[PDB]
Amino acid sequence: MGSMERASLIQKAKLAEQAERYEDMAAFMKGAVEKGEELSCEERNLLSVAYKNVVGGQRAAWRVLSSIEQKGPEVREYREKVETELQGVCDTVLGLLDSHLIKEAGDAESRVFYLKMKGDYYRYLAEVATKKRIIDSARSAYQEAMDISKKEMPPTNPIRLGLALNFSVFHYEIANSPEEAISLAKTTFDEAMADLHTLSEDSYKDSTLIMQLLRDNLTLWT
Amino acid sequence: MGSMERASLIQKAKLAEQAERYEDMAAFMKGAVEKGEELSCEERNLLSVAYKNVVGGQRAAWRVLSSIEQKGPEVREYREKVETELQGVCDTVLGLLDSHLIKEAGDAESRVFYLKMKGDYYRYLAEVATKKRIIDSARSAYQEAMDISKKEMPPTNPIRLGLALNFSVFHYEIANSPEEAISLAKTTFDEAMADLHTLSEDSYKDSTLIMQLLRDNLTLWT
Amino acid sequence: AGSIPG
Amino acid sequence: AGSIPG
Ligand SMILES: *Cc1ccc(-n2ccnc2Br)nc1
Numbered sequence: 001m002g003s004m005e006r007a008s009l010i011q012k013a014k015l016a017e018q019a020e021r022y023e024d025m026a027a028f029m030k031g032a033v034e035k036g037e038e039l040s041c042e043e044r045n046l047l048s049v050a051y052k053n054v055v056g057g058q059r060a061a062w063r064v065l066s067s068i069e070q071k072g073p074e075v076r077e078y079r080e081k082v083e084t085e086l087q088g089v090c091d092t093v094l095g096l097l098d099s100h101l102i103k104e105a106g107d108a109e110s111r112v113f114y115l116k117m118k119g120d121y122y123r124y125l126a127e128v129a130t131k132k133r134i135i136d137s138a139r140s141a142y143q144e145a146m147d148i149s150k151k152e153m154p155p156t157n158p159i160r161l162g163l164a165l166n167f168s169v170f171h172y173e174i175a176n177s178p179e180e181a182i183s184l185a186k187t188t189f190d191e192a193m194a195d196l197h198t199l200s201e202d203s204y205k206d207s208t209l210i211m212q213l214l215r216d217n218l219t220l221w222t
Numbered sequence: 223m224g225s226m227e228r229a230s231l232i233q234k235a236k237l238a239e240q241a242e243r244y245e246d247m248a249a250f251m252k253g254a255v256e257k258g259e260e261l262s263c264e265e266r267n268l269l270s271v272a273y274k275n276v277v278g279g280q281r282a283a284w285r286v287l288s289s290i291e292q293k294g295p296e297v298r299e300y301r302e303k304v305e306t307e308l309q310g311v312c313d314t315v316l317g318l319l320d321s322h323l324i325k326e327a328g329d330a331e332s333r334v335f336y337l338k339m340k341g342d343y344y345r346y347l348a349e350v351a352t353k354k355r356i357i358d359s360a361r362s363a364y365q366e367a368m369d370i371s372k373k374e375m376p377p378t379n380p381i382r383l384g385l386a387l388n389f390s391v392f393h394y395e396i397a398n399s400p401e402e403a404i405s406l407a408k409t410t411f412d413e414a415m416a417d418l419h420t421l422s423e424d425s426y427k428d429s430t431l432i433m434q435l436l437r438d439n440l441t442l443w444t
Numbered sequence: 445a446g447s448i449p450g
Numbered sequence: 451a452g453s454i455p456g
Protein backbone atom coordinates (compact mmCIF):
# COMPACT_ATOMS: atom_id res chain seq x y z
CA MET A 1 0.00 0.00 0.00
CA GLY A 2 3.03 2.20 -0.60
CA SER A 3 1.25 4.70 -2.84
CA MET A 4 -1.69 5.45 -0.48
CA GLU A 5 -1.55 8.12 2.23
CA ARG A 6 -1.26 6.91 5.83
CA ALA A 7 -4.45 8.79 6.72
CA SER A 8 -6.29 7.27 3.76
CA LEU A 9 -5.26 3.77 4.84
CA ILE A 10 -6.57 4.44 8.36
CA GLN A 11 -9.86 5.85 7.07
CA LYS A 12 -10.32 2.92 4.67
CA ALA A 13 -9.58 0.48 7.49
CA LYS A 14 -12.46 2.04 9.44
CA LEU A 15 -14.70 1.76 6.36
CA ALA A 16 -13.78 -1.90 5.88
CA GLU A 17 -14.64 -2.66 9.51
CA GLN A 18 -18.08 -1.14 8.97
CA ALA A 19 -18.51 -3.22 5.81
CA GLU A 20 -17.18 -6.37 7.55
CA ARG A 21 -14.37 -6.61 4.99
CA TYR A 22 -11.73 -7.76 7.45
CA GLU A 23 -9.15 -8.95 4.90
CA ASP A 24 -9.31 -5.47 3.36
CA MET A 25 -9.06 -3.97 6.85
CA ALA A 26 -5.94 -6.01 7.68
CA ALA A 27 -4.33 -5.07 4.36
CA PHE A 28 -5.05 -1.38 5.00
CA MET A 29 -3.63 -1.52 8.52
CA LYS A 30 -0.58 -3.49 7.33
CA GLY A 31 0.11 -0.66 4.88
CA ALA A 32 -0.37 1.89 7.66
CA VAL A 33 2.16 0.12 9.92
CA GLU A 34 4.61 -0.09 7.02
CA LYS A 35 4.57 3.72 6.76
CA GLY A 36 7.06 3.47 9.65
CA GLU A 37 5.36 5.80 12.14
CA GLU A 38 4.22 4.57 15.54
CA LEU A 39 0.53 3.76 16.05
CA SER A 40 -1.91 5.67 18.24
CA CYS A 41 -4.20 3.91 20.72
CA GLU A 42 -7.09 3.87 18.22
CA GLU A 43 -4.86 2.72 15.34
CA ARG A 44 -3.50 -0.15 17.47
CA ASN A 45 -7.08 -1.32 18.06
CA LEU A 46 -7.81 -1.20 14.32
CA LEU A 47 -4.70 -3.31 13.66
CA SER A 48 -5.70 -5.81 16.36
CA VAL A 49 -9.38 -6.05 15.36
CA ALA A 50 -8.51 -6.55 11.69
CA TYR A 51 -6.15 -9.48 12.13
CA LYS A 52 -8.15 -11.00 15.00
CA ASN A 53 -11.13 -11.31 12.66
CA VAL A 54 -9.06 -12.69 9.78
CA VAL A 55 -7.26 -15.30 11.87
CA GLY A 56 -10.45 -16.05 13.81
CA GLY A 57 -12.17 -17.17 10.62
CA GLN A 58 -9.12 -19.22 9.70
CA ARG A 59 -9.03 -20.88 13.13
CA ALA A 60 -12.74 -21.68 12.93
CA ALA A 61 -12.31 -23.26 9.49
CA TRP A 62 -9.21 -25.16 10.62
CA ARG A 63 -11.12 -26.66 13.57
CA VAL A 64 -14.00 -27.81 11.34
CA LEU A 65 -11.53 -29.41 8.93
CA SER A 66 -9.37 -30.92 11.68
CA SER A 67 -12.51 -32.39 13.28
CA ILE A 68 -13.54 -34.02 9.99
CA GLU A 69 -9.95 -35.18 9.48
CA GLN A 70 -9.91 -36.90 12.88
CA LYS A 71 -13.31 -38.48 12.20
CA GLY A 72 -8.91 -39.97 0.06
CA PRO A 73 -6.31 -37.30 0.83
CA GLU A 74 -8.61 -34.33 0.18
CA VAL A 75 -9.58 -33.59 3.80
CA ARG A 76 -5.96 -33.55 4.94
CA GLU A 77 -4.84 -31.60 1.86
CA TYR A 78 -7.46 -28.89 2.41
CA ARG A 79 -6.82 -28.69 6.15
CA GLU A 80 -3.13 -28.28 5.27
CA LYS A 81 -4.09 -25.47 2.87
CA VAL A 82 -6.04 -23.57 5.53
CA GLU A 83 -3.30 -24.29 8.08
CA THR A 84 -0.65 -22.80 5.79
CA GLU A 85 -2.85 -19.74 5.19
CA LEU A 86 -3.35 -19.28 8.94
CA GLN A 87 0.38 -19.56 9.65
CA GLY A 88 1.02 -16.99 6.93
CA VAL A 89 -1.30 -14.46 8.59
CA CYS A 90 0.27 -15.15 11.99
CA ASP A 91 3.75 -14.74 10.48
CA THR A 92 2.72 -11.44 8.88
CA VAL A 93 1.45 -10.06 12.20
CA LEU A 94 4.53 -11.27 14.06
CA GLY A 95 6.65 -9.65 11.36
CA LEU A 96 4.94 -6.28 11.81
CA LEU A 97 5.46 -6.48 15.58
CA ASP A 98 9.14 -7.32 15.05
CA SER A 99 9.60 -4.73 12.29
CA HIS A 100 9.37 -2.49 14.03
CA LEU A 101 6.37 -1.93 16.29
CA ILE A 102 7.65 -3.44 19.54
CA LYS A 103 11.14 -1.91 19.49
CA GLU A 104 9.66 1.58 18.97
CA ALA A 105 7.01 1.07 21.70
CA GLY A 106 8.23 2.84 24.83
CA ASP A 107 5.04 3.61 26.73
CA ALA A 108 3.60 0.80 28.83
CA GLU A 109 0.22 1.08 27.07
CA SER A 110 1.75 0.50 23.64
CA ARG A 111 4.38 -2.03 24.70
CA VAL A 112 2.01 -4.29 26.66
CA PHE A 113 -0.48 -4.08 23.78
CA TYR A 114 2.06 -5.26 21.19
CA LEU A 115 3.50 -7.95 23.48
CA LYS A 116 0.01 -9.28 24.21
CA MET A 117 -0.58 -9.42 20.45
CA LYS A 118 2.70 -11.30 20.06
CA GLY A 119 1.66 -13.85 22.67
CA ASP A 120 -1.70 -14.26 20.95
CA TYR A 121 -0.30 -15.00 17.50
CA TYR A 122 2.29 -17.45 18.77
CA ARG A 123 -0.62 -19.04 20.65
CA TYR A 124 -2.55 -19.34 17.40
CA LEU A 125 0.55 -20.85 15.79
CA ALA A 126 0.82 -23.26 18.73
CA GLU A 127 -2.79 -24.40 18.22
CA VAL A 128 -1.91 -26.01 14.86
CA ALA A 129 1.72 -26.93 15.49
CA THR A 130 2.93 -30.54 15.65
CA LYS A 131 5.95 -26.81 18.76
CA LYS A 132 7.68 -26.43 22.13
CA ARG A 133 9.64 -23.40 20.92
CA ILE A 134 6.43 -21.82 19.59
CA ILE A 135 4.72 -22.37 22.95
CA ASP A 136 7.70 -20.88 24.76
CA SER A 137 7.68 -17.87 22.40
CA ALA A 138 4.05 -17.24 23.36
CA ARG A 139 4.88 -17.71 27.05
CA SER A 140 7.83 -15.32 26.86
CA ALA A 141 5.80 -12.60 25.12
CA TYR A 142 2.91 -12.91 27.58
CA GLN A 143 5.32 -12.94 30.54
CA GLU A 144 7.11 -9.73 29.54
CA ALA A 145 3.71 -8.12 28.94
CA MET A 146 2.53 -9.17 32.42
CA ASP A 147 5.68 -7.94 34.14
CA ILE A 148 5.23 -4.50 32.57
CA SER A 149 1.49 -4.28 33.22
CA LYS A 150 1.88 -5.16 36.90
CA LYS A 151 4.54 -2.46 37.31
CA GLU A 152 2.97 0.22 35.11
CA MET A 153 -0.83 -0.17 34.98
CA PRO A 154 -3.66 -0.26 37.53
CA PRO A 155 -5.27 -3.67 38.12
CA THR A 156 -8.43 -2.57 36.28
CA ASN A 157 -6.73 -1.43 33.07
CA PRO A 158 -8.56 -3.20 30.20
CA ILE A 159 -5.34 -4.14 28.38
CA ARG A 160 -3.91 -5.57 31.60
CA LEU A 161 -7.14 -7.51 32.16
CA GLY A 162 -7.41 -8.82 28.60
CA LEU A 163 -3.73 -9.78 28.70
CA ALA A 164 -4.30 -11.79 31.88
CA LEU A 165 -7.42 -13.35 30.36
CA ASN A 166 -5.55 -14.55 27.27
CA PHE A 167 -2.49 -15.61 29.27
CA SER A 168 -4.81 -17.73 31.43
CA VAL A 169 -6.35 -19.26 28.31
CA PHE A 170 -2.79 -19.99 27.16
CA HIS A 171 -2.09 -21.80 30.44
CA TYR A 172 -5.30 -23.82 30.18
CA GLU A 173 -5.51 -24.64 26.48
CA ILE A 174 -1.87 -24.67 25.34
CA ALA A 175 0.55 -25.20 28.23
CA ASN A 176 -1.56 -27.89 29.96
CA SER A 177 -1.43 -25.88 33.21
CA PRO A 178 -5.09 -25.58 34.26
CA GLU A 179 -4.14 -24.78 37.86
CA GLU A 180 -1.97 -21.83 36.78
CA ALA A 181 -4.84 -20.68 34.55
CA ILE A 182 -7.35 -20.82 37.41
CA SER A 183 -4.91 -19.09 39.76
CA LEU A 184 -4.15 -16.30 37.29
CA ALA A 185 -7.83 -15.67 36.50
CA LYS A 186 -8.89 -15.55 40.17
CA THR A 187 -6.06 -13.27 41.31
CA THR A 188 -6.64 -10.94 38.34
CA PHE A 189 -10.37 -10.81 39.09
CA ASP A 190 -9.82 -10.14 42.80
CA GLU A 191 -7.28 -7.33 42.32
CA ALA A 192 -9.54 -5.68 39.75
CA MET A 193 -12.55 -5.90 42.08
CA ALA A 194 -10.61 -4.09 44.82
CA ASP A 195 -9.71 -1.28 42.38
CA LEU A 196 -13.16 -0.60 40.88
CA HIS A 197 -13.93 2.11 43.45
CA THR A 198 -11.37 4.36 41.73
CA LEU A 199 -13.12 4.30 38.34
CA SER A 200 -15.62 6.50 36.57
CA GLU A 201 -18.81 4.91 35.28
CA ASP A 202 -17.38 4.40 31.78
CA SER A 203 -14.08 2.92 32.98
CA TYR A 204 -16.12 0.79 35.39
CA LYS A 205 -18.06 -0.57 32.40
CA ASP A 206 -14.89 -1.38 30.43
CA SER A 207 -13.31 -3.19 33.38
CA THR A 208 -16.33 -5.13 34.66
CA LEU A 209 -16.96 -6.38 31.11
CA ILE A 210 -13.59 -8.16 30.94
CA MET A 211 -13.80 -9.24 34.58
CA GLN A 212 -16.97 -11.12 33.61
CA LEU A 213 -15.00 -13.00 30.93
CA LEU A 214 -12.56 -14.01 33.67
CA ARG A 215 -15.52 -15.22 35.75
CA ASP A 216 -17.02 -17.11 32.79
CA ASN A 217 -13.78 -19.06 32.33
CA LEU A 218 -13.54 -19.78 36.06
CA THR A 219 -17.10 -21.13 36.03
CA LEU A 220 -16.09 -23.37 33.12
CA TRP A 221 -12.82 -24.51 34.73
CA THR A 222 -14.12 -25.16 38.26
CA MET B 223 -7.55 -25.90 -10.72
CA GLY B 224 -6.39 -27.80 -13.79
CA SER B 225 -4.21 -30.28 -11.90
CA MET B 226 -6.86 -31.42 -9.36
CA GLU B 227 -9.32 -34.25 -10.06
CA ARG B 228 -12.93 -33.28 -10.75
CA ALA B 229 -14.08 -35.46 -7.85
CA SER B 230 -11.51 -33.90 -5.52
CA LEU B 231 -12.72 -30.41 -6.45
CA ILE B 232 -16.32 -31.42 -5.67
CA GLN B 233 -15.36 -32.99 -2.34
CA LYS B 234 -13.29 -29.95 -1.36
CA ALA B 235 -16.17 -27.66 -2.31
CA LYS B 236 -18.35 -29.57 0.17
CA LEU B 237 -15.62 -29.26 2.82
CA ALA B 238 -15.31 -25.52 2.22
CA GLU B 239 -19.07 -25.08 2.64
CA GLN B 240 -18.87 -26.83 6.01
CA ALA B 241 -15.96 -24.57 7.00
CA GLU B 242 -17.77 -21.45 5.67
CA ARG B 243 -14.88 -20.82 3.26
CA TYR B 244 -17.06 -19.63 0.39
CA GLU B 245 -14.30 -18.07 -1.73
CA ASP B 246 -12.52 -21.43 -1.60
CA MET B 247 -15.82 -23.15 -2.43
CA ALA B 248 -16.40 -20.94 -5.48
CA ALA B 249 -12.83 -21.51 -6.68
CA PHE B 250 -13.26 -25.28 -6.31
CA MET B 251 -16.57 -25.27 -8.19
CA LYS B 252 -15.15 -22.99 -10.90
CA GLY B 253 -12.42 -25.57 -11.45
CA ALA B 254 -15.02 -28.34 -11.53
CA VAL B 255 -17.06 -26.54 -14.22
CA GLU B 256 -13.89 -25.94 -16.23
CA LYS B 257 -13.34 -29.70 -16.42
CA GLY B 258 -15.89 -29.46 -19.25
CA GLU B 259 -18.40 -32.09 -18.07
CA GLU B 260 -22.00 -31.19 -17.32
CA LEU B 261 -23.05 -30.72 -13.69
CA SER B 262 -25.38 -32.96 -11.71
CA CYS B 263 -28.26 -31.56 -9.66
CA GLU B 264 -26.18 -31.58 -6.47
CA GLU B 265 -23.14 -30.05 -8.20
CA ARG B 266 -25.28 -27.24 -9.63
CA ASN B 267 -26.43 -26.41 -6.09
CA LEU B 268 -22.82 -26.32 -4.87
CA LEU B 269 -21.93 -23.93 -7.70
CA SER B 270 -24.93 -21.72 -6.91
CA VAL B 271 -24.44 -21.70 -3.12
CA ALA B 272 -20.74 -20.88 -3.45
CA TYR B 273 -21.10 -17.80 -5.64
CA LYS B 274 -24.32 -16.65 -3.95
CA ASN B 275 -22.42 -16.42 -0.66
CA VAL B 276 -19.41 -14.68 -2.21
CA VAL B 277 -21.45 -12.09 -4.10
CA GLY B 278 -23.84 -11.74 -1.16
CA GLY B 279 -21.00 -10.54 1.05
CA GLN B 280 -19.86 -8.18 -1.70
CA ARG B 281 -23.36 -6.76 -2.14
CA ALA B 282 -23.72 -6.25 1.61
CA ALA B 283 -20.39 -4.41 1.77
CA TRP B 284 -21.25 -2.35 -1.32
CA ARG B 285 -24.53 -1.22 0.27
CA VAL B 286 -22.80 -0.15 3.50
CA LEU B 287 -20.22 1.81 1.50
CA SER B 288 -22.77 3.29 -0.90
CA SER B 289 -24.88 4.39 2.08
CA ILE B 290 -21.90 6.16 3.66
CA GLU B 291 -21.02 7.63 0.26
CA GLN B 292 -24.51 9.11 -0.12
CA LYS B 293 -24.41 10.46 3.44
CA GLY B 294 -11.95 13.13 0.85
CA PRO B 295 -12.16 10.63 -2.01
CA GLU B 296 -11.59 7.54 0.15
CA VAL B 297 -15.23 6.48 0.57
CA ARG B 298 -15.88 6.64 -3.18
CA GLU B 299 -12.54 5.01 -4.00
CA TYR B 300 -13.20 2.07 -1.67
CA ARG B 301 -16.80 1.66 -2.82
CA GLU B 302 -15.42 1.60 -6.38
CA LYS B 303 -12.95 -1.10 -5.31
CA VAL B 304 -15.68 -3.33 -3.87
CA GLU B 305 -17.90 -2.58 -6.88
CA THR B 306 -15.17 -3.69 -9.29
CA GLU B 307 -14.62 -6.86 -7.24
CA LEU B 308 -18.36 -7.62 -7.29
CA GLN B 309 -18.60 -7.09 -11.06
CA GLY B 310 -15.62 -9.41 -11.49
CA VAL B 311 -17.36 -12.22 -9.61
CA CYS B 312 -20.57 -11.64 -11.57
CA ASP B 313 -18.59 -11.67 -14.83
CA THR B 314 -16.88 -14.92 -13.82
CA VAL B 315 -20.22 -16.63 -13.12
CA LEU B 316 -21.75 -15.32 -16.33
CA GLY B 317 -18.68 -16.57 -18.17
CA LEU B 318 -19.08 -20.08 -16.78
CA LEU B 319 -22.75 -20.11 -17.78
CA ASP B 320 -21.81 -18.94 -21.29
CA SER B 321 -18.82 -21.29 -21.56
CA HIS B 322 -20.40 -23.65 -21.72
CA LEU B 323 -22.98 -24.61 -19.10
CA ILE B 324 -26.14 -23.23 -20.71
CA LYS B 325 -25.51 -24.47 -24.25
CA GLU B 326 -24.91 -28.02 -22.96
CA ALA B 327 -28.00 -27.92 -20.68
CA GLY B 328 -30.80 -29.79 -22.43
CA ASP B 329 -33.02 -30.95 -19.59
CA ALA B 330 -35.51 -28.42 -18.25
CA GLU B 331 -34.19 -28.84 -14.70
CA SER B 332 -30.64 -27.91 -15.70
CA ARG B 333 -31.56 -25.25 -18.27
CA VAL B 334 -33.98 -23.33 -16.04
CA PHE B 335 -31.44 -23.53 -13.20
CA TYR B 336 -28.64 -21.98 -15.28
CA LEU B 337 -30.93 -19.35 -16.83
CA LYS B 338 -32.22 -18.35 -13.39
CA MET B 339 -28.59 -18.01 -12.28
CA LYS B 340 -27.92 -15.84 -15.34
CA GLY B 341 -30.84 -13.57 -14.49
CA ASP B 342 -29.61 -13.32 -10.90
CA TYR B 343 -26.08 -12.23 -11.77
CA TYR B 344 -27.19 -9.68 -14.33
CA ARG B 345 -29.56 -8.46 -11.60
CA TYR B 346 -26.62 -8.08 -9.22
CA LEU B 347 -24.74 -6.22 -11.96
CA ALA B 348 -27.80 -4.01 -12.47
CA GLU B 349 -27.86 -3.13 -8.75
CA VAL B 350 -24.56 -1.22 -9.05
CA ALA B 351 -24.77 -0.06 -12.66
CA THR B 352 -25.06 3.61 -13.63
CA LYS B 353 -27.45 -0.08 -17.29
CA LYS B 354 -30.52 -0.54 -19.49
CA ARG B 355 -28.83 -3.32 -21.47
CA ILE B 356 -27.81 -5.05 -18.23
CA ILE B 357 -31.39 -4.87 -16.95
CA ASP B 358 -32.67 -6.25 -20.25
CA SER B 359 -30.11 -9.08 -20.12
CA ALA B 360 -31.48 -10.06 -16.71
CA ARG B 361 -35.05 -9.78 -17.99
CA SER B 362 -34.29 -11.92 -21.05
CA ALA B 363 -32.63 -14.66 -19.00
CA TYR B 364 -35.45 -14.75 -16.45
CA GLN B 365 -38.07 -14.74 -19.23
CA GLU B 366 -36.59 -17.72 -21.09
CA ALA B 367 -36.32 -19.54 -17.76
CA MET B 368 -39.99 -18.83 -16.99
CA ASP B 369 -41.19 -19.93 -20.43
CA ILE B 370 -39.41 -23.28 -20.01
CA SER B 371 -40.53 -23.84 -16.42
CA LYS B 372 -44.19 -23.19 -17.24
CA LYS B 373 -44.03 -25.69 -20.11
CA GLU B 374 -41.85 -28.32 -18.45
CA MET B 375 -42.25 -28.23 -14.65
CA PRO B 376 -45.14 -28.54 -12.19
CA PRO B 377 -46.20 -25.32 -10.44
CA THR B 378 -44.72 -26.54 -7.15
CA ASN B 379 -41.23 -27.31 -8.47
CA PRO B 380 -38.77 -25.49 -6.15
CA ILE B 381 -36.62 -24.18 -9.02
CA ARG B 382 -39.74 -22.87 -10.78
CA LEU B 383 -40.86 -21.24 -7.52
CA GLY B 384 -37.48 -19.71 -6.68
CA LEU B 385 -37.18 -18.47 -10.26
CA ALA B 386 -40.56 -16.74 -9.99
CA LEU B 387 -39.59 -15.32 -6.59
CA ASN B 388 -36.38 -13.77 -7.94
CA PHE B 389 -38.05 -12.61 -11.16
CA SER B 390 -40.65 -10.84 -9.02
CA VAL B 391 -37.89 -9.22 -6.96
CA PHE B 392 -36.35 -8.14 -10.27
CA HIS B 393 -39.64 -6.51 -11.29
CA TYR B 394 -39.97 -4.73 -7.94
CA GLU B 395 -36.40 -3.68 -7.17
CA ILE B 396 -34.80 -3.28 -10.61
CA ALA B 397 -37.38 -2.76 -13.36
CA ASN B 398 -39.58 -0.37 -11.32
CA SER B 399 -42.61 -2.59 -12.03
CA PRO B 400 -44.11 -3.25 -8.58
CA GLU B 401 -47.48 -4.22 -10.06
CA GLU B 402 -45.89 -6.90 -12.26
CA ALA B 403 -43.97 -8.12 -9.20
CA ILE B 404 -47.14 -8.38 -7.10
CA SER B 405 -49.00 -10.07 -9.95
CA LEU B 406 -46.24 -12.61 -10.56
CA ALA B 407 -45.89 -13.48 -6.86
CA LYS B 408 -49.65 -13.94 -6.32
CA THR B 409 -50.22 -16.06 -9.44
CA THR B 410 -47.18 -18.21 -8.62
CA PHE B 411 -48.40 -18.70 -5.04
CA ASP B 412 -51.94 -19.58 -6.14
CA GLU B 413 -50.91 -22.13 -8.78
CA ALA B 414 -48.53 -23.77 -6.31
CA MET B 415 -51.25 -23.95 -3.64
CA ALA B 416 -53.55 -25.79 -6.06
CA ASP B 417 -50.81 -28.34 -6.81
CA LEU B 418 -49.72 -29.19 -3.24
CA HIS B 419 -52.15 -32.12 -3.01
CA THR B 420 -49.93 -34.04 -5.47
CA LEU B 421 -46.82 -33.89 -3.27
CA SER B 422 -45.22 -36.15 -0.72
CA GLU B 423 -44.48 -34.73 2.73
CA ASP B 424 -40.88 -33.87 1.82
CA SER B 425 -41.75 -32.22 -1.50
CA TYR B 426 -44.57 -30.42 0.34
CA LYS B 427 -41.98 -29.02 2.76
CA ASP B 428 -39.68 -27.83 -0.05
CA SER B 429 -42.53 -26.10 -1.89
CA THR B 430 -44.34 -24.51 1.05
CA LEU B 431 -41.02 -23.06 2.25
CA ILE B 432 -40.55 -21.02 -0.94
CA MET B 433 -44.26 -20.21 -1.15
CA GLN B 434 -43.86 -18.53 2.25
CA LEU B 435 -41.12 -16.32 0.80
CA LEU B 436 -43.59 -15.31 -1.91
CA ARG B 437 -46.12 -14.48 0.81
CA ASP B 438 -43.54 -12.52 2.82
CA ASN B 439 -42.82 -10.29 -0.18
CA LEU B 440 -46.53 -9.82 -0.88
CA THR B 441 -47.07 -8.75 2.74
CA LEU B 442 -44.24 -6.24 2.29
CA TRP B 443 -45.49 -4.96 -1.08
CA THR B 444 -49.21 -4.66 -0.23
CA ALA C 445 -37.88 -7.63 -0.43
CA GLY C 446 -36.35 -11.09 -0.17
CA SER C 447 -34.84 -13.17 -2.94
CA ILE C 448 -33.96 -16.86 -2.54
CA PRO C 449 -31.53 -16.97 0.40
CA GLY C 450 -29.55 -19.80 -1.21
CA ALA D 451 -12.67 -21.30 27.30
CA GLY D 452 -13.01 -17.75 25.99
CA SER D 453 -10.24 -15.37 25.02
CA ILE D 454 -10.82 -11.66 24.36
CA PRO D 455 -13.41 -11.56 21.56
CA GLY D 456 -11.78 -8.47 20.02
C1 LIG E 1 -6.76 -7.48 24.37
C2 LIG E 1 -8.03 -6.55 24.58
C3 LIG E 1 -8.75 -6.12 23.48
C4 LIG E 1 -9.86 -5.31 23.72
C5 LIG E 1 -10.20 -4.97 25.03
N1 LIG E 1 -11.34 -4.14 25.26
C6 LIG E 1 -11.32 -2.82 25.36
C7 LIG E 1 -12.59 -2.40 25.57
N2 LIG E 1 -13.38 -3.48 25.60
C8 LIG E 1 -12.61 -4.56 25.41
BR1 LIG E 1 -13.23 -6.41 25.35
N3 LIG E 1 -9.49 -5.40 26.05
C9 LIG E 1 -8.43 -6.17 25.87
Ligand SMILES: *Cc1ccc(-n2ccnc2Br)nc1
Pocket residue numbers: 338380381383384385428431432448449450
Ligand atom coordinates in the same frame (compact mmCIF):
# COMPACT_ATOMS: atom_id res chain seq x y z
C1 LIG F 1 -33.11 -20.70 -6.84
C2 LIG F 1 -33.42 -21.74 -5.67
C3 LIG F 1 -32.39 -22.15 -4.85
C4 LIG F 1 -32.71 -23.05 -3.84
C5 LIG F 1 -34.01 -23.51 -3.70
N1 LIG F 1 -34.32 -24.44 -2.67
C6 LIG F 1 -34.31 -25.76 -2.79
C7 LIG F 1 -34.66 -26.30 -1.59
N2 LIG F 1 -34.88 -25.29 -0.74
C8 LIG F 1 -34.67 -24.14 -1.40
BR1 LIG F 1 -34.84 -22.34 -0.66
N3 LIG F 1 -34.97 -23.09 -4.51
C9 LIG F 1 -34.71 -22.23 -5.49
